[PDB]
Design a protein around this ligand. Structure first.
Ligand SMILES: [Zn+2]
Ligand SMILES: [Zn+2]
Ligand SMILES: [Zn+2]
Ligand SMILES: [Zn+2]
Lengths: 360, 360
């Protein structure tokens, strides 16, 4: 059967298992089960499933070149789908909690979960906690007998932790590090000295690349029992490179994509985020442009936001983006070539992952 | 060395390991490490450490009757301390997130973490996420070589999930189950039909007993490689019984203990919580008393809160509490007797746990 329909069918199976277990082992009543069903659907469904489907696609690649009984092929594909849903539910956790943390209004054209009338922040924080707990229930149930259970749980933990650390890097990126202090309300930077390429790269590496690219690629290897088919250092390098490019695209869209195509109103400027646009602008601006940026960035005032967007537009950041893109293309192709030494099949799966990202 | 000083020494070691790893593997800078150090201290230290020390005390009990090399005794005690800190950090996670969810003001006489000036909700939600992620880093690092790693991680996951489910039961306990609906803002019950002993017992079982009593007792058995010394069904029964009594005491104190001894201003009445006091009052009130309760419960108005406390005082709930306590004493002693069939030593550790709870 087609990959996406298998993946969606496994969602229904996993959902039924989780809710049936709540009834048989956690004393849940039907109305609370219905609440949790709706919560799961609303927070986990509706995206493109790129992360989860990467697990499936990696596993499919190895199936095409490896000898297996049919029942083993089916088991591997089912495991890849469950692992993919673990990643989708991990993302759902972070999106629920991040939307609360950031006071976000919409996501994908619909209200953020905490804003639903019968949810509220009091429930939504805990709903997000449940979403991540479900990833572990999935693993322990479906992968109980599997040789890769330990490695998969360990990997998942490290990626989850890296993501939380990256969230810290993101939410504090507009403050001066030397002034961080739980006792003192945090002012926005005035010098923007920490708006550098290396600091930006650290935010992005931790907040998105581990869970968006590294985890799906490695989970695909694990469910395929194929980690020996790769040089793991290369997998990490290519995941972090593609993931950075993905986030750069998101940063550009936050400012310039119309809200109707973006699914929300972008507020990176008002939030004073260390975005690719801000770092790149500061890397080419003259003194007068720097001063005008400082007088306007990080303010909710629409007039000041408009000034910042004007500065970005006049700064010809399309030039810098094309130069960045051309360099990423160079480096990603080089890493794919190196991956071919040990596994042409995995290299091809990464090439597919890159094509989908680049042409998004 | 004395048990508490070993436990506190292990805290410093674990903290140093976690922060050193953030520097060596997660690219953290010194100021963010300092923020996280302060966060860990503020959220994890200052309580009585009853949960973590239960792990240590259970392990000490088995050490007194089991033949081991000295280095093995030291390893077991170190493992018990690390496991105990996993439980304390799990609690710290739930307290950080619960205080945000509930809009709480103080905890232990100090501001809730999210209210610190340089924290804010935006950071504190993620700080709570980090606290629970640290429990897993502890386990994978310190217990990497241990035969009990799998069982301990599986147990911890189930208890974490049960606690989140219990949080859902608690936050929704003042609503009618048949009206739960993410799409519709939730009104408080008017009939109080779900304020029953069995529904109360479900809230308490999941929201506190698993992590407060079951997890420390079983973790103590696991680090001692002694789970075969017990009938696990009895361990569960006695943990859930003692844990319920613990929460009943907390419910009584929320209403009647002066805020200076309580560490916070109790708001269970204004919050319309399904507390032991409310359930027990409704189990003995006449029609006029029920009507007066309904007209006043779940309102912030101090006059209405005062009415509810008057109703509780005039209802002689001390009578019901002494009858409840006498029954718990009966049942806990019976379960301790049954535990002696397979392990007098573990039975004694449970007797100690009960004495500390009862005389609190
Ligand atoms: Zn955010
Ligand atoms: Zn963005
Ligand atoms: Zn609460
Ligand atoms: Zn309480």
């Amino acid at each position: 059967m087609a990959s996406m329909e298998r993946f969606l069918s496994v969602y229904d199976e996993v959902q039924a298992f989780l809710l049936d277990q709540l009834q048989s082992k956690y004393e849940i009543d039907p109305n609370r089960a219905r609440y949790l069903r709706i919560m799961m659907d609303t927070t986990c469904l509706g995206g493109k499933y790129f992360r989860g489907m990467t697990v499936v696609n990696v596993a499919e690649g190895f199936l095409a070149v490896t000898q297996h009984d049919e029942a083993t092929k089916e088991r591997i594909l089912h495991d890849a789908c469950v692992g993919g849903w673990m990643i989708e539910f991990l993302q759902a956790h972070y999106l629920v909690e991040d939307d609360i943390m950031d006071g976000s209004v919409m996501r994908r054209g619909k209200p953020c979960w905490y804003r639903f009338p019968g949810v509220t922040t009091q429930c939504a924080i805990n709903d997000g906690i449940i979403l991540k707990s479900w990833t572990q229930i999935m693993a322990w149930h479906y992968f109980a007998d599997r040789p890769f259970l330990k490695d998969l749980l360990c990997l998942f933990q490290k990626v989850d932790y890296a993501t939380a650390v990256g969230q810290m890097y993101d939410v504090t990126s507009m403050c001066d590090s030397n002034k961080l202090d739980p006792e003192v309300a945090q002012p926005m930077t005035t010098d923007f000295a920490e708006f550098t390429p290396a600091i930006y790269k650290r935010i992005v590496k931790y907040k998105t690349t581990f869970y968006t690219y590294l985890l799906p690629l490695v989970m695909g290897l694990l469910v395929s029992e194929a980690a020996a088919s790769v040089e793991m250092n290369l997998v990490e390098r290519v995941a972090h490179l593609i993931g950075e490019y993905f986030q750069v695209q998101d940063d550009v869209m936050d400012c310039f994509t119309p809200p109707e195509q973006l699914g929300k109103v972008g507020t990176d400027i008002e939030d004073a985020k260390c975005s690719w646009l801000a770092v790149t602008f500061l890397g080419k601006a003259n003194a007068a442009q720097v001063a005008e940026f400082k007088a306007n960035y990080g303010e909710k005032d629409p007039a000041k936001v408009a000034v910042v967007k004007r500065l970005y537009s006049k700064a010809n950041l399309q030039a810098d983006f094309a130069a960045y893109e051309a360099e990423v293309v160079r480096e990603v192709e080089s890493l794919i070539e190196q991956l071919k030494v040990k596994s042409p099949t995995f290299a091809e799966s990464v090439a597919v992952v890159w094509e989908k990202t680049h042409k998004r």
